[PDB]
Amino acid sequence: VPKLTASVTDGAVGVTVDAPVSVTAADGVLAAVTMVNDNGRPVAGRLSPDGLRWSTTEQLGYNRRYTLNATALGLGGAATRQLTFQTSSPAHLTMPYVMPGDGEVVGVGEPVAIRFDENIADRGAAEKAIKITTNPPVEGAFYWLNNREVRWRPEHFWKPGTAVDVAVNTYGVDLGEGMFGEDNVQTHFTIGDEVIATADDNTKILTVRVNGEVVKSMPTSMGKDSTPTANGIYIVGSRYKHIIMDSSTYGVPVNSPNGYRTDVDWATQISYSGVFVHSAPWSVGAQGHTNTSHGCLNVSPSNAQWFYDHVKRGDIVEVVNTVGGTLPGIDGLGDWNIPWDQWRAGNAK
Ligand code: NA
């Protein structure tokens, strides 16, 4: 007599939709399989050529009730089952967003970033749902900067030519306190040339190195003693032909002593706290000699444009020997300032 198996049991509740629903016939073949929702709408599925396995072919829905009818035939006899089950009903939904973009070529400092639009009560579940693939394979780990964003990077800077695949399979996954993922995301990026630029407060020079060779030496003016540029490793972020810098976006009023509202050209972002490489005609004389800025690396127009043209997202800017501290690891572009052993251990709780 044919036997029927299913990936769900009749009367089940909280069936997660991260996996498809299957039905298997033993000692026989599947003659008919149908699955409809509470409204009577049929679900897409495909039967295997051998007739032994049937699986849904489209993702299932939240807060739904599904009814499954299966018939199995064989030389001996026939068997029919009806199964109804309710999927999980999330309390809230959160959509993930992944950087860098699909197909992008990025520098050796670009981490993998998964940002959610809600606080994540169960970080371990989120890390479990994210699969990272590297070629050549290299060790990495997760670390959380705030409650909504997590990062993945190796111990050392990426090796150029490394392929990276990010599968955020959070759909159907309970991320804590009834917070389920809105969808799945799949992005892929590649590591380009090694580009490391160093800013030494002693020489007041920003040197750009491509694959270990000096290609540009830029005299610069960094943060003055009152508002210094922090030392450490910076990841290059967004680039702007021109951008109005407003201190108020960082909580500093414009009318305050340290506030400002200045329009600059050829601005490359290297920290979330507002540190940029940008064109500063007004300080070309100070550049290479004294620090006079709020934190940004002031350089000449031609050098700023050159930086814009030859530096890509993920490249590195390291600052040393300034009177400031060290760029916070939680900044958003300061991932590499966290010691490896701390990063490796993670903060999943
Ligand atoms: Na329902």
Please tell me about this protein's structure:
The PDB classes it as antimicrobial protein. Keywords: L, LdtMt2, Inhibitor, Covalent. The assembly is monomeric. The entry is titled "Crystal structure of the transpeptidase LdtMt2 from Mycobacterium tuberculosis in complex with cyanamide analogue 31". The protein: Transpeptidase,Lipoprotein LppS. Helix content is 6%, strand content 42%. By secondary structure, it is mainly β. The chain folds into three domains: 3-85, Immunoglobulin-like (Sandwich); 92-193 and 340-345, Immunoglobulin-like (Sandwich); 197-337, L,D-transpeptidase catalytic domain-like (Beta Barrel), CATH 2.40.440.10. Sodium ion binds next to loops.
